[PDB]
Amino acid sequence: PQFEKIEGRMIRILYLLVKPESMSHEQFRKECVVHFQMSAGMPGLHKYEVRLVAGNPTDTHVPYLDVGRIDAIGECWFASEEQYQVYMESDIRKAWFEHGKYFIGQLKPFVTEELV
Amino acid sequence: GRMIRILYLLVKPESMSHEQFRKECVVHFQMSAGMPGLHKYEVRLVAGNPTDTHVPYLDVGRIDAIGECWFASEEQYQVYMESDIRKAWFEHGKYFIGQLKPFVTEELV
């Protein structure tokens, strides 16, 4: 509705996650869930989502782009500049990032921007 | 719940400027309206590439836009794949997307 339209226009950062080389896939899935649970009430954060990569189809109609193996995709929404700064200044966020350090081997962030 | 999601990394053709690509992303989005079997479509530009991560940074080269498709069920997905307008839509994708990486995702919570 109106809500989803304005939400889509928030500050959004999308992440490609690669699990640590030594961590099992089973454990990585559990730590993704813990990381989502830890996001509840995170100051300044409007929404968090984390998903596993379940499939890597290669029969594309466009030339295929190989980026190596990605294990999960994360995404953060912030409603405003002020809320992003609340988040960046938060000690609760710093603890969340400590947990990230445990279960994320490598990370690619994209800050996105809306069109129409 | 039965929801299927596919996320795409899009690189523009070398024959296109960034502005030309932006305009074709808008066209692609407009084309997608009322697409058979599709629940939601989103396309957005990559505006920034922060590199001060607190874990090791992963370089995947230059990604220009992110697309995402939602399908409410497996049945909706098959209606989409057999649609003639979806096939024409994919032809437009061949025009404005130089390279792309699809990810089929799975929900965790």
Partner: peptide, 5 residues
């Protein structure tokens, strides 16, 4: 840009 049912 997005739409949804």
């Amino acid at each position: 840009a997005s739409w949804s049912a």
